[PDB]
Amino acid sequence: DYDEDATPCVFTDVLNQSKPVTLFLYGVVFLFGSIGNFLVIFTITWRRRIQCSGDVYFINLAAADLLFVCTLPLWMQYLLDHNSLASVPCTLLTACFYVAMFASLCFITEIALDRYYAIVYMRYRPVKQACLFSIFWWIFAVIIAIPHFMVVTKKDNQCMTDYDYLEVSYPIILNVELMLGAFVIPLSVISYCYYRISRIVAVSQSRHKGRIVRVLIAVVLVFIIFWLPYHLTLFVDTLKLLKWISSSCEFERSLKRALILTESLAFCHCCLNPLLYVFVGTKFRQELHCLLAE
Amino acid sequence: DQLRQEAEQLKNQIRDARKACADATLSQITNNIDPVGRIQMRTRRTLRGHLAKIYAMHWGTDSRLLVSASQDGKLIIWDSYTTNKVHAIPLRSSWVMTCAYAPSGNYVACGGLDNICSIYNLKTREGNVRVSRELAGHTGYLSCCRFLDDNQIVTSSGDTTCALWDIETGQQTTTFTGHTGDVMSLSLAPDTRLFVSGACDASAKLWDVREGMCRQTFTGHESDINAICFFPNGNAFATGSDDATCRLFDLRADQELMTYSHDNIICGITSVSFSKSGRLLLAGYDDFNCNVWDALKADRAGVLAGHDNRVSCLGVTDDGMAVATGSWDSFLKIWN
Amino acid sequence: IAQARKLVEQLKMEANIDRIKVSKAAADLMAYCEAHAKEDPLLTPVPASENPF
Amino acid sequence: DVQLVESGGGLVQPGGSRKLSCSASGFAFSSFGMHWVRQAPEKGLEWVAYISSGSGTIYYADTVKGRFTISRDDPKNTLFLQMTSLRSEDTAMYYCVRSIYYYGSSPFDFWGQGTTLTVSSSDIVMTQATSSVPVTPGESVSISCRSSKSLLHSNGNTYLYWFLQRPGQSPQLLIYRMSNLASGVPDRFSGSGSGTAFTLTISRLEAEDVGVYYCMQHLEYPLTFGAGTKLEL
Amino acid sequence: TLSAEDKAAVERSKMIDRNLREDGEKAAREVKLLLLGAGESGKSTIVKQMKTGIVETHFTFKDLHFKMFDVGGQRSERKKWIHCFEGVTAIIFCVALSDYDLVNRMHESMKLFDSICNNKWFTDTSIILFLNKKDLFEEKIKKSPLTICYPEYAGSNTYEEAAAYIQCQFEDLNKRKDTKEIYTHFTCATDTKNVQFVFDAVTDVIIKNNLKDCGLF
Amino acid sequence: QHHGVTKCNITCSKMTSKIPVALLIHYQQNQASCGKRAIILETRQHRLFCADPKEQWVKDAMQHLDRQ
DSSP states (O other), X not given: OOOOSOOOOOOHHHHHHHHHHHHHHHHHHHHHHXXXXXXXXXXIIIITOSOSHHHHHHHHHHHHHHHHHHHHHHHHHHTTTOSSSOOOOHHHHHHHXXXXXXXXXXXXXXXHHHHHIIIIIOOOOOHHHHHHHHHHHHHHHHHHHHHHHTTOEEOSSSEEOOSSSSOTTXXXXXXXXXXXXXXXXXXXXXXXXXXXXXXXXXXXXXXXXXXXXXXXXXXXXXXXXXXXXXXXXXXXXXXXXHTSSOOOHHHHHHHHHHHHHHHHHHXXXXXXXXXXXXXXXXXXHHHHHHHSOO | OHHHXXXXXXXXXXXXXXXXXXXXXXXXXXXXXXXXXXXXXXXXXXOTTOOSOEEEEEEOTTSSEEEEEETTSEEEEEETTTOOEEEEEEOSSSOOOEEEEOTTSSEEEEEOTTSBOEEEEOSOTTXXXXXXXXXXXXXXXXXXEEESSSSEEEXXXXXXXXXXXXXXXXXXXXXXXXXXXXXXXXXXXXXXXXXXXXXXXXXXXXXXXXXXXXXXXXXXXXXXXXXXXXXXXXXXXXXXXXXXXXXXXXXSSOSEEEXXXXXXXXXXXXXXXXXXXXXXXEEEESSSSEEOOBTTTOSOOOOOOOOSXXXXXXXXOTTSOOBOOEETTSOXXXXX | OHHHHHHHHHHXXXXXXXXXXXXXXXXXXXXHHHHTGGGOTTTTTOOTTTOOO | OOBOOBOOOEEEOTTOEEEEEEEOBSSOGGGOOOEEXXXXXXXXXXXEEEBOGGGOOBOOOTTTTTTEEEEEETTTTEEEEEEESOOGGGOEEEEEEOOOOSTTOOSSOOBOOOEEEEEOOOOOOXXXXXXXXXXXXXXXXXXXXXXXXXXXXXXXXXXXXXXXXXXXXXXXXXXXXXXXXXXXXXXXXXXXXXXXXXXXXXXXXXTTOOSBBOOEEOSSXXXXXXXXXXXXX | OOOSSHHHHHHHHHHHHHHHHHHHHHHXXXXXXXXXXXXXXXXXXXXXXXXXXXXXXXXXXXXXXXXXXXXXXXXXXXXXXXXXXXTOSEEEOOOXXXXXXXXXXXXXXXXXXXXXXXXXXXXXXXXXXXXOOHHHHHHHHHSSXXXXXXXXXXXXXXXXXXXXXXXXXXXXXXXXXXXXXXXXXXXXXXXXXXXXXHHHHHHHHHHHHHHHHHTOO | OOTTSOOOOOOOSXXXXXXXXXXXXXXXXXXXXXXXXXXXXEOTTOOEEEEOXXXXXXXXXHHHHHHO
């Protein structure tokens, strides 16, 4: 006889379309991350035994990527309608998850900083001081991911975050945090450092200078191309959360689809990440050529 | 020649004479003394300013400021209490092996491989520091300039000649020649009438500043000596050598007393400094860490392991309130 | 040649000196060290009020 | 030696604009936090505005904030103060004062000659004791100056200064941080006192030292002078 | 808590700390060149190619500023002050070819090379060898073999193979061929081309250092 | 947690008014994986409306759910 104005719009269609692609992306990222980090950690530890600073950063970035991709099989084995069983403790899972992601990002930042200082200033770092900075970055990763995993509770079936017992505007603070510690500050610092060292090395009339600037451009482009839509999606999602320029359920489901897809692309970044820094290096290319047999 | 065998018979006479008085080891008489214990010093500050290896530093007379010199070409007058940088003096030549801070606080001397340790005048009306004078005349390389006062400065050298300059007339007065090595350190006595010098002859010598003649000669090291500090009383002085040992000579006993050696230690010594009382004998070892020493018991009482490269300079405040073990990683660390 | 004469003269001048016994030269030194152990902030860690760091 | 000379001055129209310029020859102008100070023709000094070294920090007196501005021309060694909306209380003689801040430094070392400016028709208050003290050459003088806040900072040196403006001249520093001596003055001067109670002791006075002594503090901006004690014979 | 006027003192520290960094950057722009050699071997001949104790030679070439350190005058124990140069980009050597009969002083030079190449401080710095004085070497080799000082040699008396062989003989003392790279140019009175080699070599070693810092190589 | 895994199919912002219970043939609870623990009920003509768990009417619903 009559109805109302506000009605819920179900997400079964978008979720049922997105589960195959997120499962496939989780599987391939787990595979590529394992086979591209288990190798880097072997080659730069088993033989040379952590000879330099850069090595300490590459090791810790690879460890962060390895933990990130080792959280993925639990997630893909959980999202397949496994609520009556396979009850993994979500608090520890998302804790390790977020600290590994933020550790990877801040260690990319640290590699850029070390390439900045060791080139423009000749201010080389000691290996022990590099380890101290690595422990500092791990602690910073814990204290920068503490907004996320300290709130995710555990009901009987799933694990969830409560927006009705705590601040309604807190997720905005969370989302801005996720686009601050991951995208704005890291992209700014890596762009500034790599532009500075590129402008410095462009003076050398030698021909071997072409390689490094290209890989720096490459990593910047890889950091751009594999992160730019997702955080912009988060940006417009924050725009939805502030109700500045919003629309109806169609925009919300399209935003959810773009959000899961571009987050999967962002998660795909971390498997290609080790190829950018270590394995471009000839000193590791011949090392793998010699040590592939083992 | 006859003078040669005369010199050996004199050396035999000196050795027999100093053997006639060594009737008690210092450790033997101090064996019944309660030990210091353990000295857990912590790095109270860190001024991450320099970029190259640091080769010297001299604390202020008022126990707060400290001048530190480094291979980047700028020696900077720190404020140890508040981590500030009072001054920054760009050198003519970036090679610096020594720097001194005058006991009046208004003069800084510094030198290196350029055979000139220039004299800078800090407290000037003109606002900015400048080379007050360019003391030249050495033919080797200076290693330790120290200020007697605002006019007299003693300088070491690499051409076997310690010199006593006179700032206001520029040209020196005396020339403490006599040992044919490479003087790598000096040390003024607390009454500033006598000073000792350590060369690469493995033979520290006690010179009379006023007269100009070598008062005493000390031996007992095999390799070169590059670190000496007077005991606060002024009758003893500890020498640091590449032998991995520090030796404590006495002026009135005219001979070695202790050998602060350690079997585990194989690295050299860069700088040595007593404490205010003299009980603690700090020393900057070459294995990237400092090492304290109970200077009456010959056994260590703590390690100041806080550096990544070799600690190349030390200094203990006139108040005894702090040390600061400057190293080659461009970081001084004011321990306490 | 004359440098040998200068060297032997320096040793002869340095040899004519009075060297006290190491017993006294160590007892006075250790007595000085014990008489200043109450004014040395490195032996005994000073409390954090007088300490300016 | 060190030289500070100004320009501008004369008579202006109220409410107008005037860029007062202070030259600087004979020192490292690039690393001197400069000041400006007012002197009305019948009373004591008052702080105008402070500029740091390399223009990294700017302050103003509360009565002049939002009306003036300081610009540094380091390559040509010239300090400009631009005045806008000058009212009838803004007429005075203006001095540009060099000052360097580090440990053991003496701010307000050297003061410019100053220029006159004649327009047409909370904070620590440093109270003095009197306005005149009849003295004779040879005897001692004991000027006193109370305060309104504990000038003894945590680091243990009270940031109180002293000056001396001899007639028809510019004031120069005598005592900085209540105990020290300015480089160029006899050691007969001596400050003393506790927090909020300070004393200058001119021992064995002679002639040519009959100018006004301006008690000043420097703990927190706005630094404020005193009314001065004009001793005579 | 905060200070009062001492915050401006902190600003003074920052105001020179920034300047310190802008001098540190400029220090990384400069190229260091330690210059060794036997007693008047070729030092004057190589310093005269382009514009007391150490006599530093500042000069620039194609937007790159070089410092040269003639440390021959330091008549003292070399090992006491040689550690000051751990960080110098390149040890530009200069050994005369014509000095191969007086006192076999090249073997003395080999000892000097043995002291500086096998040195613990210079375990990563290149050695740009300079076997200059080609003309007088050709005169003294047209009338005398190399066997006068090195009997083990059993080749010929022509210039090219013997010069390449002694270059390789110098290079064989490296013992650490991977971390460093001992260059060499047989140049005397070659005008600007000598300097061109210097610029090329230092750009090469700077690029190698940057590649090692970033990890590529 | 992260948006790539979400298990809630709700968008409840404004909640409806009183509704005839007999019209509401069925109702279901919701996956409380994004905080808003509510009830999603369907009408006779199968239109879905969100509601607060204060309403005890769904209680009475259960018996005629059991009885029919």
